[PDB]
Design a protein around this ligand. Sequence first.
Ligand SMILES: [Zn+2]
Length: 46
Amino acid sequence: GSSGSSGTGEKPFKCDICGKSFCGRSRLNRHSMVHTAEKPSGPSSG
Ligand SMILES: [Zn+2]
């Protein structure tokens, strides 16, 4: 496995946290939520 994303350039969408692309926002939108998936119960990183 290596850097791909080959085909008619990149996707019509892109992330803001990791820049992840998604052929369809319907997916990306949700992905942008995984970046803020952290509970208080667990510790944090300095
Ligand atoms: Zn992302």
